[PDB]
């Protein structure tokens, strides 16, 4: 069921002159994110944190401090440059966690191997009033 690609260190990182928008202590003690793509040719792109960087020929790896930054970079790589990308979440313990595209196909296209999470089989107007769920730990929408 789509073995997620394994993060490969030693892959070159994009040409960048340094910035004040990079990683901070959260990356050191909590978590940080890594995005990888291929880019057929060397070209200049807009970084999600600072100015402009140049993608090296072949594989490129970039580490960001936020998942939203990774998604913005992936969207720009997918729509402007027509490049396929994947990014991971890295913990200080040394763990890596494949994140996106979770099942090899982007979440936009329906896949037969996905289960429903948080789907309510009713219209939004058929939720109970708060009084019916008062003094119970549940919320009217959680039902």
């Amino acid at each position: 069921g789509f073995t997620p690609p394994e993060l490969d260190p030693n892959t070159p990182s994009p040409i960048f002159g340094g910035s004040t928008g990079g990683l901070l202590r959260k990356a050191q003690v909590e978590e940080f994110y890594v995005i990888t793509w291929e880019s057929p040719k060397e070209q200049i792109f807009e970084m999600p944190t600072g100015g402009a960087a140049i993608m090296r020929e072949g594989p490129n790896l970039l580490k960001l401090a936020r998942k939203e930054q990774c998604l913005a970079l992936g969207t720009r790589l997918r729509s402007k440059y027509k490049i396929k990308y994947q990014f991971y979440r890295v913990f200080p313990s040394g763990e890596v966690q494949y994140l996106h595209p979770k099942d090899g196909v982007y979440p936009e296209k329906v896949n037969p191997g996905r289960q429903g999470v948080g789907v309510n089989f009713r219209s939004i107007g058929k939720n109970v009033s708060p009084i019916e769920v008062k003094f119970t730990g549940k919320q009217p929408y959680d039902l």
């Binding site: 901070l24 401090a65 979440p107 329906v110 996905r114 429903g116 789907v119």
Partner: protein, 80 residues
């Protein structure tokens, strides 16, 4: 972590999925409409609460609802 719910009025237009800026929503197989699709929210732990998904839903009322809940460092969108 904010709570995102998908209601059965969803028409599987996919516009909410295109809008999420943290990859929280998905499209899953379904049988109650013409598209055989419906939205899912399996990764609400990464939801930032932007409610950009709701702005894209064409049904009335909405088929995707975001209920802001307990805040985490991921939900607060903090890079430090």
């Amino acid at each position: 972590s904010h709570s995102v719910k998908i209601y059965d009025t969803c028409i599987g237009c996919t516009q909410c999925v295109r809008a999420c800026p943290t990859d929280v929503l998905e499209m899953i197989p379904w049988g109650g409409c013409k598209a055989k699709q419906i939205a899912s929210a399996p990764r609400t732990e990464d939801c930032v609460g932007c409610k950009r998904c709701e702005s894209a839903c064409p049904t009335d009322f909405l088929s995707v609802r975001v209920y802001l809940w307990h805040e985490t460092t991921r939900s607060m969108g903090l890079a430090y």
